[PDB]
Design a protein around this ligand. Sequence first.
Ligand code: NAG
Ligand code: NAG
Lengths: 49, 50
Amino acid sequence: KGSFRFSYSKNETYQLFLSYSSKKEKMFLHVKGEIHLGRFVMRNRDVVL
Amino acid sequence: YEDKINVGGGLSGDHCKKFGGGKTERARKAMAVEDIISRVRGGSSGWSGG
Ligand SMILES: *[C@@H]1O[C@H](CO)[C@@H](O)[C@H](O)[C@H]1NC(C)=O
Ligand SMILES: *[C@@H]1O[C@H](CO)[C@@H](O)[C@H](O)[C@H]1NC(C)=O
């Protein structure tokens, strides 16, 4: 009498996950204002001190 | 099969494969430029600037 038995089982599970995110914002500005009143022109020559 | 003498035979085969791929890309951009200029030669010391 003879009876042989064999059993083999394999099991594999791999998982990979990757995520990347980037956000950027920039704001640079300038404002200016001048309220002028009056202008003068100094005489160049024949000047008193 | 078995006749005058006995003969034994056994075979088994099983294979399984599973592949996976996932990709996602997102991008967003916005730009706005607003400039205001005002020149007034009114003729008032204060009110022209005001
Ligand atoms: C024979 O192989 C199958 C897969 O091919 C398996 O499911 C079963 O368990 C195996 N038999 C024994 C007794 O392990
Ligand atoms: C093992 O392999 C079987 C294929 O027969 C599959 O269904 C099962 O999900 C696998 N086990 C794992 C933990 O993934």
